Amino acid sequence: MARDYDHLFKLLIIGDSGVGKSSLLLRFADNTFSGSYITTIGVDFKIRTVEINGEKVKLQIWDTAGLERFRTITSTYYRGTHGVIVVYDVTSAESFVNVKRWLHEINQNCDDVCRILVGNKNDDPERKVVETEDAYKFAGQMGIQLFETSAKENVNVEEMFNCITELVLRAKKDNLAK
């Protein structure tokens, strides 16, 4: 409806290099996908506005470097962040086992933040090594929701960003009451 946003949130995407962090954002924001791999240097970002239950919500989405030598100062990633998207690759056992260190990094840097866990590259059943039921059970233990996605074929990407946007919106309404 072209009005001024009702809410502004900052979302942060973190997780291992190669896991598809940029690809998730690029598909959500520009509806594009490329087989090309350009490693993210420091931070990139995208600004999009979504409609959620009649409310206009502006999202400032930060896409971080997976490679430690291209990571800029962690404090700067995290300042002012409302929601963190933690991404692993369902095809990489190693990307999954590092999820706990990313969760710990969130705790190191944030007091009160919404989180969501994303298993990307769910495109190739033959090479899937992180089974839904194990990831789901782990998500449950950490009190976060799980989304398995494919940036490649655009499956569950919108749903995922919608979820974390809803979480962040509900945390905001809840803090106002208290």
């Binding site: 001024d4 502004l8 400032q60």
Partner: protein, 195 residues
């Protein structure tokens, strides 16, 4: 003890900054080539990034600095002074730990004989802040200097009322400014002069 505030009027100030940040971000395009991004961020290669900053961001930022700005302040040393956004810049860029660069920038824009106006100095200062990824840093530094704010602003001015009545809206403003620090700016401080 009640301060009268129209939240929509204050929102208006932030909205203009929002619009400017959006235009500037749109200008940097969707290329993933850093070399292209640096070119788009260079005001000699892309005059347009200079135009966007000059015609959108600088006036939106100046309007924030002007909201409830006292016409005059009475200086302890100098006596009475016309009070302008540039006065607030002088106040909030004094040398100390963690602010050497910020002070250096004030000094270098102050010394340009090409500038000839306090509004032009203010604009060059903003161009400068973008180069050193510090526009948000400076705003936050300004906000946290309660002495500078009591000196230069009326209670209903945004930068003042931020502390009391609408701290969230000022948080929005800072958030809006954050991604400018991620953009490869290379702006001629004398861009306005060269037009």
């Amino acid at each position: 003890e009640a301060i009268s505030i129209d939240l929509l009027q204050k929102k208006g100030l932030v909205k203009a900054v929002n619009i400017a940040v959006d235009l500037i971000v749109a200008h940097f395009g969707t290329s993933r080539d850093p070399g292209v991004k640096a070119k788009l961020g260079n005001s000699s290669v892309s005059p347009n990034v200079g135009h966007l900053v000059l015609k959108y961001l600088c006036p939106a930022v100046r309007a924030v600095l002007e909201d409830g700005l006292k016409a005059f302040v009475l200086d302890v040393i100098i006596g009475q002074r016309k009070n302008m956004p540039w006065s607030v810049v002088e106040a909030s860029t004094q040398l100390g730990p963690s602010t050497k660069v910020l002070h250096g920038l004030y000094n270098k824009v102050s010394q340009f004989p090409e500038l000839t106006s306090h509004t032009m100095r203010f604009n060059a200062f903003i161009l400068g802040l973008l180069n050193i990824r510090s526009l948000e840093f400076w705003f936050n530094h300004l906000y946290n200097h309660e002495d500078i704010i009591q000196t230069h602003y009326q209670p209903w001015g945004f930068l003042s009322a931020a502390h009391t009545v609408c701290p969230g809206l000022f948080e929005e403003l800072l958030l809006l400014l954050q991604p400018l620090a991620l953009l490869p700016f290379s702006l001629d401080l004398l861009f306005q002069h060269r037009l």
